[PDB]
Design a protein around this ligand. Structure first.
Ligand SMILES: [Cl-]
Length: 127
């Protein structure tokens, strides 16, 4: 369980890192920020794959991870589109970044991560 909570926090981290890196790239045009977005995106996928391996024997958790993953996939597709339009297309990139806001994927992911965290905490207590 303690291993699972670390993994959950590392997922939150990677999602924030992808967002902040994408914003940094739009702002500066410095490829280093794009690299960071790519790294965070890759790390997120890897951390999701591994968390799923920790929760393999818990159907309620597997379902919650499935749900988080849906949300993180939609969010990553949003950021990736903005990164694709990029600083060379500022107005387009901004229009899309702002349109993406209406889905509240960020809030929804944080809620999704809490459900997993609380469940592991409740779980540990029970056990
Ligand atoms: Cl998954």
């Amino acid at each position: 369980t303690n291993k699972a909570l670390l993994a959950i926090s590392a997922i939150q981290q990677a999602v924030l890192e992808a967002e902040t890196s994408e914003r940094g790239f739009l702002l500066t045009g410095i490829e280093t920020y794009r690299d960071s977005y790519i790294r965070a995106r890759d790390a997120l996928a890897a951390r999701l794959d591994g968390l799923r391996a920790v929760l393999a024997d818990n159907p309620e958790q597997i379902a919650h991870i499935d749900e988080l993953r849906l949300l993180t996939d939609m969010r990553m597709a949003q950021l990736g589109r903005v990164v694709e339009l990029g600083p060379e297309r500022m107005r387009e990139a901004l229009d899309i970044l702002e349109q993406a806001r209406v889905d509240r994927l960020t809030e929804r992911i944080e809620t999704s991560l809490s459900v997993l965290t609380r469940a592991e905490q409740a779980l540990l207590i029970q056990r």
